[PDB]
């Protein structure tokens, strides 16, 4: 296991992942922590990474740094998304072998899996079919990162662990109704409909930063919200899944302390990465119901037939002694409570 | 097109591929050629590649350099085979964009295709299923190289062409009966059986570097050869395919001069690489017959039931105006004639 005084380099420490991880390292008593901003350490620069590892000699590495973005960025910056990730991956993973790092964790995602994979999707389904177009270059870079870890382990007996977490959520989500994910977007829509339904107009104005009630009402029509109704686009049959960032961070710690390459072999050794997730999925419609209940919205949900399936199999991490602890309803209450506190609105 | 005085950097110029290409560049009148040995330019070294491109400013790049080896090396050196190729690929492809290279060609292989792909295997079958274990890390590195080329083209309007040639053969094959491919191995076995069958013992001794006839005969039993018989292992039902290195080199030239990224697009742009091959496959048994006839062995072929399918679709390169010119029987006669000249044995 890692000692409390072990020197642990966390690369990509500022993202949602890196942050959650730094926090959990602090929670568990780890003091001897190193990390650098981009401004301070270009991880695509071979010489800079080698000079960092020379000067610092980290015992443990957690590689959460990636060039990542939304659907649009992935589809625009296709060269940057494959080249930078390939370079970050190769420089950090190679130098760690060279500098005799005791254990490395590489954080990828379920982006590595085929778009039409069968559910539930075990690690054994990697490469069994083609990838989604829009993130194809990032996804290949991540598959390469997996293969780097497994390759170094098989050739050089390193202990480089790769994980593929599912879709994440936290209290650090964005509730911008223009740019936000399905969960925080429905949560805020549902809250706004409650405010209209209960005629809590001070809260409504404050939430939206409007100063005319009538303009607030007009504006919420764009999102399918009025005082009796919240509109969800589609039938609500697509599934999603959610892993809370604190559960991801806990599983990172558990892996570093309790799961080594030897636990993940079985004579052709493949798919020695680990899915991390709740081993559970949910329909948009069910999700919308849960959020309706948590928010306490009393009006109607409408699924408008004018306009994907996901289930990551986490059996293997379960058989190695880790299960997520935050169930979806609890994670959504916690998010809503942070949200209300930041909007200065009461339940 | 490339001008005769255009500066053309050929990376990996000493391998079977690089060599064939340098030769064909000479044949077509290209004088202004640059290339470096490893000893002179470590292509995994980011700074060295950037300093090379700074000092030389090549107009055209042909990237044939790879860490490659046989079945054993691929399965031993798994980390070196993914890491070095990823690094060679990223450094050369990125620097070429940075240094405004006019056109780049990246040479991969049919290693990118699924092990159970349906025949004939078009470029559209890339990633439709899992890869062979033994070369999995090299193959992922090559898929990454494809995605690098296509990504730079889509994001930055570069003209980086990737090709996936099928299995190669030439006059530079090895006829070591211990380590050789199916084609040169059967050709030499068949020749040795002819020599025994026709009692051409001076030739037989000379071919094997033996000096006892009886020891020569004992030794050829290890390979399934006597004066009446040549043994082929298996039923002879597996298929192979063959592209002559000179045809590959010609197609490289044709691509550089006549096929640009815009010819290879059709709104989700994928699989803009090009298969290169004869658009033809052959069974081991048929191959053995052809070689028997060419050699003029008069005895029997025996397929010993004590102990794979391949067909690369080259429609797309055909529809762009290039077809291989060396049919298998001609390529095998040429190899045999070089072989006999190097062994100083007559037909």
Are residues B147 and A127, on separate chains, in Cβ contact within 8 Å? Answer: no
Query: Technique behind this structure?
Result: X-ray
Q: Which two tokens stand for residue B166?
A: 């099928």
Angular region, B157: left φ>0, alpha ψ -120 to 50, beta rest:
left
Claim to verify: residue B137 and residue B236 sit in the same structural domain: no
Q: How far is B77 from chain A (nearest CA, A)?
A: 6
Which residues in chain B touch residue A72, judged by CB atoms under 8 angstroms apart? none
Say which of B113, B138, B169, B339 is annotated catalytic: B138
Nearest CA in chain B to A89: B83
Residue B144 CA neighbour count, 13 Å, CB half = 40
Claim to verify: residue B137 and residue B174 sit in the same structural domain: no
| Cβ neighbours, 10 Å, residue B192 | 24
From the list A55, A50, A123, A56, the residue with the least C-alpha distance to A93 is A50
Separation CA A189–CA B124 (nearest Å)? 42
Q: Which domain holds residue A286?
A: 170-240+280-310+327-347
- CB nearest to B152's CB, from A76, A79, A154: A79
Residue with tokens 């950037």: B50
Measured CA angle at B216 (ends B211, B221), to 5 deg: 170
Claim to verify: residue B13 and residue B152 sit in the same structural domain: yes
Cα torsion B19, B25, B30, B34: sign:
negative
Are residues A82 and B141, on separate chains, in Cβ contact within 8 Å? Answer: no
A181 annotated as ligand-binding: yes
Claim to verify: residue B208 and residue B234 sit in the same structural domain: yes
Claim to verify: residue B151 and residue B295 sit in the same structural domain: no
Separation CA B266–CA B68 (nearest Å)? 33
Claim to verify: residue B71 and residue B94 sit in the same structural domain: yes
Max Cα-Cα span within chain A: 69
Based on the structure, what is the number of domains in chain A?
2
Claim to verify: residue A178 and residue A315 sit in the same structural domain: no
Claim to verify: residue B123 and residue B224 sit in the same structural domain: no
Q: Under an 8 Å CB criterion, which residues of A touch B? A: 45-47, 76-83, 86-87, 89-90, 93-94, 97, 126-131, 133, 136-137, 140-141, 143-144, 147-148, 150-152, 154-156, 268, 270
Q: How far is A260 from chain B (nearest CA, A)?
A: 18
Are residues A79 and B154, on separate chains, in Cβ contact within 8 Å? Answer: yes
Q: Under an 8 Å CB criterion, which residues of B touch A? A: 45-47, 76-83, 86-87, 89-90, 93-94, 97, 126-131, 133, 136-137, 140-141, 143-144, 147-148, 150-152, 154-156, 268, 270
Angular region, A7: left φ>0, alpha ψ -120 to 50, beta rest:
beta
Claim to verify: residue B40 and residue B136 sit in the same structural domain: yes
- CB nearest to B147's CB, from A82, A89, A93: A82
CB A247 within 8 A of CB A169: no
Q: How far is A77 from chain B (nearest CA, A)?
A: 6
Claim to verify: residue B18 and residue B141 sit in the same structural domain: yes
Strands (E) in chain A, as ranges, are: 8-11, 33-34, 60-63, 103-107, 160-165, 168-169, 229-233, 239-240, 243-244, 274-276, 282-283, 300-304
Claim to verify: residue A247 and residue A99 sit in the same structural domain: yes
> What is the stated resolution of the deposited model, in angstroms?
2.1
Q: Is residue B133 annotated as a catalytic residue, yes or no?
A: no
Claim to verify: residue A289 and residue A160 sit in the same structural domain: no
């Amino acid at each position: 296991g890692m000692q409390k005084d072990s020197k642990i380099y966390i690369a990509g420490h500022s993202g949602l992942v890196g942050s959650a991880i730094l926090n959990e390292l602090k929670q568990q008593g780890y003091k001897n922590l190193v990390f650098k901003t981009h401004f301070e350490l270009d991880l695509t620069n071979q010489k800079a990474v080698a000079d960092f590892f020379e000067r610092e000699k980290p015992e443990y590495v957690i590689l959460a740094a990636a060039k990542a973005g939304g659907i649009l960025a992935n589809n625009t910056y296709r060269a940057d998304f494959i080249y930078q990730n390939l370079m970050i991956e190769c420089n950090v993973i190679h130098n760690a072998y060279l500098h005799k790092v005791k254990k490395l964790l590489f954080i990828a995602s379920t982006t590595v899996y085929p778009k039409n994979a069968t559910l539930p999707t075990s690690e054994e389904q990697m490469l069994s079919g083609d990838l989604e177009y829009t993130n194809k270059p990032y996804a290949i870079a991540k598959i390469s990162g997996l293969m780097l870890c497994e390759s170094y382990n098989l050739q050089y007996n390193t202990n480089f662990i790769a994980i593929t977490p599912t879709n994440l959520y936290g209290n650090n989500d964005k509730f911008d109704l223009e740019k936000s994910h399905v969960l925080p977007g429905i949560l805020r829509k549902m809250h706004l409909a409650k405010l209209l339904n209960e005629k809590r107009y001070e809260d409504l104005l404050n939430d939206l930063k409007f100063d005319s009630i009538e303009e607030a009402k007009n504006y919420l029509k764009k999102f399918g919200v009025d005082k009796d109704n919240v509109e969800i686009w589609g039938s609500g049959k697509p599934t999603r899944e959610f892993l809370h960032s604190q559960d991801l961070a806990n599983a990172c710690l558990f892996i570093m302390n309790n799961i080594d390459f030897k636990d993940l072999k079985s004579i052709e050794i493949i798919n020695t990465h680990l899915n991390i997730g709740p081993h559970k999925n949910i329909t948009i419609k069910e999700l919308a119901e849960l959020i309706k209940n948590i928010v306490g919205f009393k009006g109607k949900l409408v699924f408008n037939l004018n306009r994907m399936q996901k289930f990551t199999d986490c059996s293997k991490i379960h058989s190695l002694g880790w299960k997520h602890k935050i169930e979806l309803e609890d994670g959504i209450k916690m998010m809503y409570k942070w949200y209300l506190k930041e909007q200065n609105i009461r339940q």
